[PDB]
Amino acid sequence: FTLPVRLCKEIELFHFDIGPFENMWPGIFVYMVHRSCGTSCFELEKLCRFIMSVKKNYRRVPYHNWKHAVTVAHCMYAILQNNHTLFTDLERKGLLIACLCHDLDHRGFSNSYLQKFDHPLAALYSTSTMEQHHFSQTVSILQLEGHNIFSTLSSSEYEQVLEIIRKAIIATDLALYFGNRKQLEEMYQTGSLNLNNQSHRDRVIGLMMTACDLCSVTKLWPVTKLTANDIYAEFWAEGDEMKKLGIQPIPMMDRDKKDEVPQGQLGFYNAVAIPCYTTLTQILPPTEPLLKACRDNLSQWEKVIRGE
Ligand SMILES: Cc1ccc2c(c1)nc(CCc1coc3ccccc3c1=O)n2-c1ccccc1
Ligand SMILES: [Mg+2]
Ligand SMILES: [Zn+2]
């Protein structure tokens, strides 16, 4: 497989939509891997077995699916390329694998669901429930025979890459974004943020995981609109099951209030999405097309509320 040349320069666009090229997404990740880290950074043998076993371990849920992991992975690719100068090979290796893997085996279900009804995984993992599991899956497949793509790493360089991926996967729990984005906002406007400080890198990386994770709000409006169907299809199913017992789900998961969606978008943009890309853009000025595309979509949703 080789990427049809009519992309190449289209893959480098922040707003790039992977949708129409489903049979290609395994080759795009290889492509995004090949371009970034160089080719021979893994054995092409064990990157494919890895890619394809990550794949098959995504469920046929409407949104937290294979298509989404590739959409997050792609967005890390675009962020990295435009920030070539200031990440390391061991980082640009783990972060792309971490993005492809960060929702592994998702069930179409919130952490709040899995705890409010004694779900066994929340018995395992009491905080960051689904995200501690995604990392769990990642480690399993890695250790499966002929799948350790990090075999060509020294001892202390292998346990390094594992840490980055773990941290990045955990940071995709939106409940930790809010504190992390606010810690990041203090330092930059006190002036005290130091990219040499390892723990600051972790915050920065965490936010880059957050920005990638929500990046269907940074696409061209037609694409960003259709993705929203998939997000609510899945919220509405989680609410439908909170309903089956007799419990009224938050209006975000209540299908009986689709009417309320464009308002909830705008507020979600104004409370989650715009602050995140706003911060990422101050740390990483090249990521500003993400912020610009987020504004554009927000005003789109405002026209939807305002009758236009
Ligand atoms: C009736 C109603 C009440 C609240 C709604 C709402 C509708 N729609 C939302 C936002 C739902 C949503 C969640 O995760 C995403 C992840 C990536 C990209 C977009 C989204 C997204 O739109 N919210 C919301 C969620 C969080 C904060 C503010 C609003
Ligand atoms: Mg998730
Ligand atoms: Zn996700």
Number of distinct beta strands? 0
Q: Could you state the oligomeric state of the chains shown?
A: monomer
Give the N-to-C terminal Cα separation.
44 Å
Helix count, per DSSP?
Answer: 13
Shape, please?
Answer: globular
**What is the helix fraction of residues, given as a range?**
55-70%
Supply Rg.
19 Å
CATH class: Mainly Alpha
Could you say which structural class the secondary elements and strand pairing correspond to? mainly alpha
- Number of individual domains: 1
CATH topology: Catalytic domain of cyclic nucleotide phosphodiesterase 4b2b
Percentage of residues in strands:
under 5%
- CATH architecture classification name: Orthogonal Bundle
Order of helices and strands: HHHHHHHHHHHHH
Largest sheet: none
CATH-level-4 superfamily name: 3'5'-cyclic nucleotide phosphodiesterase, catalytic domain
Bound molecules: ligand DKU, magnesium ion, zinc ion
Structure description:
The protein is built from 13 helices and no strands. By secondary structure, the protein is mostly helical. The protein has a single domain, classed as Catalytic domain of cyclic nucleotide phosphodiesterase 4b2b. It is globular. Bound molecules: ligand DKU, magnesium ion (MG) and zinc ion. Magnesium ion binds at residues 64, 103, 172. It is classed as hydrolase.
In brief:
This protein has 308 residues and is an all-alpha fold. 64% of the residues lie in helices and 0% in strands.
Keywords:
monomer, 308 residues, mainly alpha, Catalytic domain of cyclic nucleotide phosphodiesterase 4b2b, 13 helices, 64% helix, globular, binds ligand DKU, binds magnesium ion, binds zinc ion
